Amino acid sequence: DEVWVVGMGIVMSLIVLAIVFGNVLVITAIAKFERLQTVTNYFITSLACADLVMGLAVVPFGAAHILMKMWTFGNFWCEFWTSIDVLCVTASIETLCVIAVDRYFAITSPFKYQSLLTKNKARVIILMVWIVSGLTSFLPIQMHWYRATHQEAINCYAEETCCDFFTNQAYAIASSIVSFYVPLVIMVFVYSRVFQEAKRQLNIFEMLRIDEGLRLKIYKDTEGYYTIGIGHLLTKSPSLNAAKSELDKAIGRNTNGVITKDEAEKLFNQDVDAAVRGILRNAKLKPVYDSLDAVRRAALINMVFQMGETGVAGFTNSLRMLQQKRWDEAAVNLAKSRWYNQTPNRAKRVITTFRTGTWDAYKFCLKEHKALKTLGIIMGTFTLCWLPFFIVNIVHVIQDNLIRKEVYILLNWIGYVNSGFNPLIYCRSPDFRIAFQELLCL
Ligand SMILES: CC(C)CCC[C@@H](C)[C@H]1CC[C@H]2[C@@H]3CC=C4C[C@@H](O)CC[C@]4(C)[C@H]3CC[C@]12C
Ligand SMILES: CC(C)CCC[C@@H](C)[C@H]1CC[C@H]2[C@@H]3CC=C4C[C@@H](O)CC[C@]4(C)[C@H]3CC[C@]12C
Ligand SMILES: CC(C)CCC[C@@H](C)[C@H]1CC[C@H]2[C@@H]3CC=C4C[C@@H](O)CC[C@]4(C)[C@H]3CC[C@]12C
Ligand SMILES: OC[C@H]1O[C@H](O[C@H]2[C@H](O)[C@@H](O)[C@H](O)O[C@@H]2CO)[C@H](O)[C@@H](O)[C@@H]1O
Ligand SMILES: CC(C)NC[C@H](O)COc1cccc2[nH]c3ccccc3c12
Ligand SMILES: *C(=O)CCCCCCCCCCCCCCC
C-alpha cells in the first residue's frame, strides 16, 4: 500500500542515480582523455548532456508526481519541467540523426572513417541542434500552442496541483512528427546505408587483415624469418639490415623497418597477385580456382597464404568437392584438417565463406565496424524505448482514450529509463571501457 510507494521510491531513486552517474562518467571520459576527443564523441557528449538533464531536471519531478499523486511544484515549474522534458527527447533524436549523417559521409569519403567536420563546426552543429530543439520544444509550450480548449484541461491548467500534458490534436500530430518522426526516419534510413557501405568495404585485404594480422614493424614469423605487413616475407637471411634493405627496395624509400598501413596494402596486393599466378600454374589448384567465384577465390587464396600451394593441393577430396560446388561436403572434409586443429577460428571463417560465398563470417570483426555497431545499438535502443510512447501519441489523435493512462505513463518511463542505457552500451568499446576503469580508481 504505502510500503509499496517506499519501494517504488527506492527503485526510481536508483534509476535517477544510474542516469546521472553513467552519463557524468561518459562526459568526463571524453573531456579528460584526448584519445576520445573525436567529432563522433562530441555528439556523444551532446547526447550524454541531454540524458543528464533528463536525469537531474526531468525524472525526479516525474517520479515525485507519481508517488505524491499530485503536482507540488506550482504551474510555472510545471510548464518549465514539461518544456525541458520535450527538449531533451527532441535534442536526443536530433543528435542521433546528426551522428548517422556524419557517419555516412565519413564512410563514403576518400579520406575514410573521419568526419567532413572540423572540431569547431561540429560544435556549431551541436549548438544549432540545441537551438532548433529549443525552438521546436520551448516555444510552443510557453506560447501555449500545445493547450487543449475543452473544460477538463482548463481545470488542470488552472489547478496548481495538476500537471497533465493535455494537448490539442494539431500540436499532438505536428510536434510528435517534427521532433520524433522526422529525424527518426532519416536516422534509420541513413544509418542503414552506413551498414551497407561498411559491408561493401569487405574484401580479400580485410579478410587477410583479420585472419593474419597487419604489422607495421619488421617481425619474425614462426620459422624465425623476417616478415612485415600481412605475412610478407622480406628475407630468409638472419641479417636484420638485409631485411631492411629488401624492405626499402620494395617500398621505395628509407623505412628503417616501419611502414604504413596503406603501404602494407601495396605489398599485400602484390603478394595476392603472385599467389594467383602460382595457383594458375599449379595443375591441382588451377581447375578449382577457375570454377570458383570471386569471394571463394579469396578464401582459397587465404589458405595458400597460410599453407603455401603445396599445403592446399594436399586436400584432394575437398578441392574436387569445391570444384563441384558441394560446399557442405567440402566443409566436412576441411574441418578434419591439421589446419583446423592448429588455427580453428581462422579455418572456421574461411570454411564458412566456402559455404555461403559471402563475407558474413567477417562482419563486425574490424575495430571500425564494431564501432559502427555500437552506434547502431544506441540508435536502436532509443527507437525501441520511445517508439511505443510516440505511437500512442498518434493513436489517441485518431481515437482518444483507447489506451489506459497507466500504460501511457509506463511507456513514457521506458523512454525515461533509456537515458541510463547509453553509458553501459559504450562499454562495448575498448577505449571507453579502459577510460572508465581509470576514472573509477581501478
Ligand atoms: C540546466 C540544468 C537543469 C542541468 C545542469 C546542466 C549541466 C549538467 C550541463 C549544462 C552545460 C554542460 C556542459 C556544458 C560544457 C561542457 C564541455 C564538455 O567538454 C564537457 C561537458 C560540459 C562541461 C557540459 C556538462 C554538463 C553541463 C554543465
Ligand atoms: C535548456 C537548459 C535547461 C539546459 C541547457 C542545455 C545544455 C545541456 C546544452 C545547451 C548547449 C550545448 C552544448 C552546446 C556546445 C557543445 C560543445 C561540445 O564540445 C560539447 C557539447 C556542447 C557543450 C553542448 C551540450 C551541452 C549543451 C551545453
Ligand atoms: C542528486 C544526485 C543525482 C547527485 C549524485 C551525484 C553523483 C552521481 C556524483 C557526485 C560525485 C561524482 C563523482 C565524483 C568522483 C568521480 C571520479 C571521477 O574520476 C569520475 C567521476 C566520479 C566517479 C563521480 C561519479 C558520480 C558522482 C558520485
Ligand atoms: O605461401 C605464399 C605466401 O607466404 C608468405 O606469407 C605467409 C607465411 O609464409 C606464413 O608463415 C604465415 O603463416 O602465413 C603468411 C600469410 O598468410 C609469403 O611471404 C607471401 O608473400 C606469400 O604469398
Ligand atoms: C510526462 C511527459 C511530459 N513526458 C513527455 C515525453 O517525455 C516527451 O514527449 C515528447 C517529446 C518530444 C516531442 C513531443 N511532442 C509531443 C506531443 C504530445 C505528447 C508528447 C510529445 C513529445
Ligand atoms: C575513485 O575514483 C572514486 C572514489 C571517489 C570518491 C568520491 C566520494 C564522493 C562522495 C559522493 C557524495 C555526494 C552525494 C551527493 C548527494 C546530493
Numbering used by the authors: 29 to 230, 1002 to 1161, 263 to 342
Task: Provide text from the study.
The β2AR used in this study is the carazolol-bound form of a fusion between the human β2-adrenoreceptor and T4 lysozyme. Carazolol is a tightly bound partial inverse agonist with a low off-rate that stabilizes the receptor in a particular conformation. Crystals of β2AR grew in IMISX plates at 293 K in 1–2 d. The space group was C2, with unit-cell parameters a = 108.04, b = 170.58, c = 40.44 Å, α = 90, β = 106.30, γ = 90°. Earlier attempts at RT structure determination by the IMISX method were not successful, with the highest resolution reflections reaching 4 Å at best. The data were collected with 0.1° and 0.3 s per step from 149 crystals in one well with 3° of data per crystal. 104 partial data sets were processed satisfactorily and merged, providing a final data set with a total angular coverage of 312°. As expected, the published and the IMISXcryo structures are remarkably similar, with a backbone r.m.s.d. value of 0.200 Å over 442 residues. The IMISXcryo data were collected using 30 nl of mesophase representing 0.58 µg protein and 18 nl 9.9 MAG/cholesterol mixture.
